[PDB]
Each structure stands twice: as structure tokens, then as C-alpha cells.
Structure 1
């Protein structure tokens, strides 16, 4: 089970992209995706027909295009993302305006056209003499093996347009920052203004995890995916630099493509159960200071198979407005469960589970639960501190009886 279907639309700006990227599309069709290749200018393009989506995934290898054909629009690609489709975008120095508008609607701000990422210290020896083919060190690669793959990677070659993640947007995934020395500017023209991006703020690859759990990756370089950089060796041009027999471009491209298309980090929430400990079923309402067991099952997509989740650190909350209790759910009996005593306070509480971890799917679960005060029958009875007060009334009624006996018959 791929958590999105195989139906994939490829948008190319020229058909020779299919020949020059053959290894990538081979390494994607071999996963069972069902590609179709269309020119991004083609008037027959559409994603929605009669309100249904015609494709489950979209790949926009169309950096230079000023407008999409047909009814494809940044408003339509926005509605596609809000529909839950996954999108892959590759820019370049040819970046056309609508890719910048799409970034602005995602919150990833591509620099101007003609701009490039520059790095005068880590440009590759193979650079054309402009110091814009940069060897991005894997020290910068995000610490998220679900995204970037669990194996080690040799340095990776990038050549493209830097982008800035808007600090206003919390969901943005800073996957591959530029070097501390790199920056983005017009390479020919002097630095009159302040750069758009400078230092480690420069992003080469950035991701998005939407609240509907849509995923988008914006790559700053198409060439990044090319067979040239897959086959090329790599060596920093400055002296004292090792030569690596192969770039890590390929394994990282595969791991990214697996992430985007919901092949890793997909999590599901199954049934949730709560009951009074020792009972088998939930009461309509719990009492103050009752003792309740809570159990949940969480599953993970592995090789397209759902399996019980491994994660250790899941936390339950018990919330009225602010959280009253927060505790780790223990992994027991194939389930996640905890036993705890309800707070001293009645109200309409909610159980929450909020397993938000980098690269994993945002899991949210909530069950509303009213906690009611004690019933009048449940109050404490025969309190031994009060025996004098019981013996008082059971003296008074006896005195009254004996008096009613004597008074009438004396």
C-alpha cells in the first residue's frame, strides 16, 4: 500500500529532460509509479476534471516556463496540495515567475531570476569557472533519516537557485542548508544591496509537511537530479581536498523521492479504547478521582505493509483547557496504554495524543470524556468520628418513647 496512488504527472520544459534524467525516472518507474510526460506548455494539461483529481503525484521539472498550459495554475496547484497530493518542484537560474508564486504560497521564497547560489570555498573543481557548482557538505544534511535515508552519503553536488524559508511558517523543513560561506546573488553584478540569503540561511532543498499531511519538496537545482551529477566524481577545488569516486546525489534523490511519495514515515492511528480499570467497557461518565485505563494502537507503513509502530516517546495528555496530566504511554501487549487516576476536578475533559516528530506523519487523536462529581449515594457513611451524633438521635428517640409510655400511664 502506497499511501498515495501511483498516478504521477511529469511536467517537462523540454522533452530532452526525459533522456537526460533517464536514471531517475527508471529508479521511479521501478517502484511501480505510472508516469506520464507532458510539456508544461501543453494546452491539454489539467489536474481536476469534474471535481476529481486525475493524478496523485505531480513533478514540476519545468523551471523556465512563464505559464502553465490548460487550467493548471498556482491556485490549482494550491488546491491540489490542499487535496492531499504530493508535489515535487525543481528550480534553476531560469526560474520563471509562477514557480516563485508557488513558493510564496508554500512559504519558500526563491531568489530572483538569473541569481545563483555562490560559494567561493566549496565550488567543485569541475565548475565552469563561476564558483556556482557547490559541493554541499553532508554536515548540513538534516538530521532526519526518514527524509534523507539512514545510510551515509558522500558529498552532493548542487547548482541552482537559493531559497529562504520564511521564519513566520513553523512547518517548513530545512532539509539542506548552504554552507556558512555560501550566498545567493547576481554573480556578475556587485553587492550593492544586502543578499537575499547569506550563510547557513541559504537553503538548497526545503520541504513542507501540510496539516493535511501533504508533502512538498522544492529543490533549487534540476541538474541535481541529472544523470551527469549521478555519475560525476566530486572533489573540492581548494587544495587538500579528497577525491570521492562517486557523489551521494543518487541515494539522496531516491530517499527524497521515497519521502515525498509517502513511502516512509507514514503513520496511522487505529482504535482507541478507555475504560474504568477492571471493567471491559467505557461508562457514560467517569467520577472524580476514578481510575481509568487508556489504550491506543499506532501502525507504521513498512515496505508498503502496515506494522505495529516502534516509537518509544509517545505522550498522552488529559486536557480541560490547559493539560492536567501528561505521561508517557507504555508499549504493552502490542498497544500503547497507561493507567492513571483522574484529577480532582469535574468537567468535559479530552484525551489527546499528539505524536509530532520530524519527518513522521503528524498524528492527532482526541476523545471527549465528561468527568462528573460524586453521586449522593457514594458519599462516606457511618463515619466513626460521628458515632456520638448517631447515638444522640438514637438516644432521643428512646427517651421520647419511654416518656410517651410513662406520661400517659402515671
Structure 2
């Protein structure tokens, strides 16, 4: 289940109590833990199995206490075992452990001195970002234009990895400044205020760079976005199961009864399903592509639905002809769309040449009638040659 790290004298837990009690409205068995009130190290593993499903880190400074509770390598080892992480930063409080751990994930937050500044007076007392800058669906999609408060914040430079899922953008006219005479950290629209990250084991992380965002004094602007952001962070909003990835002949027989062959008619069928936290619903989607593949791909065919069930929408590919190239081909569906869950289904099959019997026959072909007629003529003339040769008298 969930876990809360926090501390007093920087950001108390009382001014977050609207959201955690929302997690109490679900079946999340929360388990708090307090820096500057607890000296025991978190038994995050007893021997080899994982106690907590989730972790939530409220803003703090990471001098010695945070490295006592969770170091970087223990957090890597927690995140590879489907351990969902929600982490927060601010220019008033940059932890060092979380900054290095995010640097391992290709997310580069701004350090202690650097603060983001937006002019043009959006609110002119604190920074605030409208809902135009939400880059990705499947985490939150705004039905109408609204504002999201960000009191003092810090942006992140992002590496170009596949796994990183951007969620919100800096408002394109902002920058960073420090008290020291250092260079600017990020440009206008290249900094990202909140950043998601999805593991290859389908574990998720959300770095969210403001202490004034999730507070109890802000439900008038960022109430639904934080609730569905926390729906996305823990695997509850958008995950995908792929149930039956089966291929067979076009007339219904399987690979087991008759193995495949060059220039053959097959069918392929995979079905997807998503999960809104309560029910496995059928997954409506374009963009799903079959690949028939050697070292290089021989087929990329987009999948039409052609099917339905109570908790699964299937997808077909139509009757397609196998290549005349012999070899060991793999049947691949990598559904890899950022924002929602990665799935891979592959089945490696051998596809052989034609047998010596399974050729166009000599009487079937229009060109070989001459030679069948001439071989039959030589044979019948040979039989009359031996009977005529024996029955004559020399």
C-alpha cells in the first residue's frame, strides 16, 4: 500500500489533508512516516519481497535524513518492481536524493537557487498556468479552459527517452533566475512543470514541481487535475491488458494441425482492454499495428476492430498473404503509445517452402500437355513395338 514521507518546519502534512483523505475514500491503506519525528530506517524490503505498492514524497530538504530513509539505489530497486512514485520539488526545497534519482530517469529539475518567472501578469502574485499547456491526454484532458496555480516553481529539462511522458508545459514566456550569477536553466517552453515517467515494467512516477500546488488552500483551480493526476500515477487510470493474440489459417485450421507455408492465407487477432479503476472496459483505439517480422519487418498492418465482448474489444488484420521468402518469422504487436500502458505480444513461427507434392501439377498446367502427350505416345508406340517385334517372323 501507499506511504507518505514528509517533514515539519518546511511543509506540514495538514495542508495536504484534502487529497490523502480522498485516498482514504478509496481502499488505499495509507501509512505515514515523519522526518524530524522518526529515526528508524524504512524496511522497504524485508528480504526480497516488497511491502509497499506506492510511495508519496512531500517536499523536504535532503541533508542526511532523506538519505537515511531512502537512498538512490534503494529507490531504483523499488521502482523496478512496480513501485509507483509521486515526488515533489520546489526552489525553496530541492532534495538531493530525489534530484539524483530523477537524473537517472532523464528528468533534470532546477537546483536550489533557480526559480521560474513568468511575466505578462497572469496573476502577478503567484505564477499560474492555463490548461492550454497540457501536452498529453490519458492523464488529464480539460473539458474547458481553467487555471492551475503554481506559487513558486522550478522547471525540468527532459531527455529524449521513449519512457518519459510529459504532462504539463512551462507557459512559453518563462525563464529561471538565481541569486548567483549562473546561466539560465531552461528556456520558455522547454521546461516542464510536471513530468510523468513510465517504466518498462509499467511502473509510474510523477515529478510535480511546486509545493503550492497540492495544498489544501487550492481546490478552486487544480482539484480535478490533481485527483486524476494521482489516478494516473498509481496504476488506476490507464492500464491495458492484451488477452488473446492468436493467429490461424483463413479457413479456420491452426498452425498445429497444418504448419504454415510460403504464400499462405492467415488471420491474426488480438484484443485489448483498459481499466478505469473499477471495470475492465473494451479499449477503443486506432494506431495498433501488426508486424510480420524477420530481422527487418515484412508487414505493418493497422488493425480494424471487427469484434466486441463485455470486457474486451478485439482487433483483426484481414486475410493477408505470407511472403514467398522462407524463414522463421515472428508475429509482433508492440502497442507502445506514451501516456498509457505498453504491451508487447510476439509469437515466433517457422514458415517453410513448398513441398515437392504441393506444386502446380503437369496436367494442370497448360504448357505441359505437349510433353505428356509425347511421353504417352512413346510409351504406347513402345508397347506396339514389343508386341509387333515378338509376333513378327524373321
TM-score by length of 1: 0.87
Aligned CA-pair RMSD: 1.9
Q: What residue in structure 1 maps to residue 311 of structure 2?
A: none
CA distance in 1, matches of 2:287, 2:119: 43
* 1:12 lines up with 2:6 in the alignment: yes
1:23 deviates by 0.7
The answer for the alignment partner of 2:177 in structure 1 is: 185
- What's 1:37 paired with? 32
Give 2:328's aligned residue.
348
Distance change (3 Å), C-alpha of 1:168 and 1:302: closer
Output the CA distance in 2 between the equivalents of 1:306 and 1:174: 26
Report the equivalent of 1:76.
Answer: 74
DSSP 3-state at the match of 1:229 = coil
Deviation at 1:122, TM superposition (A): 3.9
TM-score in terms of structure 2 length: 0.90
State the partner residue of 1:202.
Answer: 191
Match of 1:304 in 2: 278
Match of 2:163 in 1: 171
The match for 1:223 is: 212
Q: 2:117·2:174 contact (CA, 8 Å) conserved in 1?
A: yes
Q: Which residue of 2 aligns with 1:367?
A: 347
The CA deviation at 1:71 is 5.8
In structure 1, the gaps of 5 or more residues are: 1-6, 128-132, 231-245
The size of the alignment, in residue pairs, is 378
Does the CA contact (< 8 Å) of 2:163 and 2:198 recur in 1?
Answer: yes
Q: Unpaired runs of 5+ in structure 2? A: 309-313
For 1:374 and 1:288, locate their aligned partners in 2 and report how far apart those are by CA, in whole Å: 7
Which 4+ runs in 1 deviate beyond 4 A? none
Deviation at 1:287, TM superposition (A): 0.9
Question: Equivalent residue of 2:243, what SS?
Answer: strand
Map Cα deviations across residues 107-158 of structure 1 (whole Å, 9 max, x no partner): 1111221321112224534x2xxxxx211121111241x2014533521111
> Does 1:21 find its partner at 2:16?
yes
Where does 1:27-176 land on structure 2 (aligned, <5 Å)?
27-40=22-35, 42=38, 43-67=40-64, 68=66, 70=68, 72-93=70-91, 94-122=93-121, 124-125=123-124, 127=125, 133-144=126-137, 146-176=138-168
Partner residue in 2 for 1:389: 371
* In structure 1, C-alpha distance between the alignment counterparts of 2:114 and 2:60, rounded to whole Å: 13
Query: What's the CA shift for 1:75?
Result: 0.5
Instruction: Summarize deviations over 1:132-189 as a string: whole Å, max 9, x none.
Output: x211121111241x20145335211113442333334232222111122211221x44
2:321, 2:388 → 1: CA distance?
Answer: 58
Greater per-residue strand proportion = 1
Q: Which residue does 1:236 correspond to in 2?
A: none
State the Cα deviation string for residues 26-48 of structure 1 (Å, max 9, x = none).
Answer: 12211221111102463231211
- Paired residue secondary structure (2:379): helix
With 196-205 and 337-346 compared, the bigger mean Cα shift is at 337-346
User: Residues 330-345 of structure 1 correspond to what in structure 2 (within 5 A)?
Assistant: 330-334=304-308, 335-338=314-317, 339-345=319-325
Q: Is the 8 A contact 2:109 2:157 kept in 1?
A: no
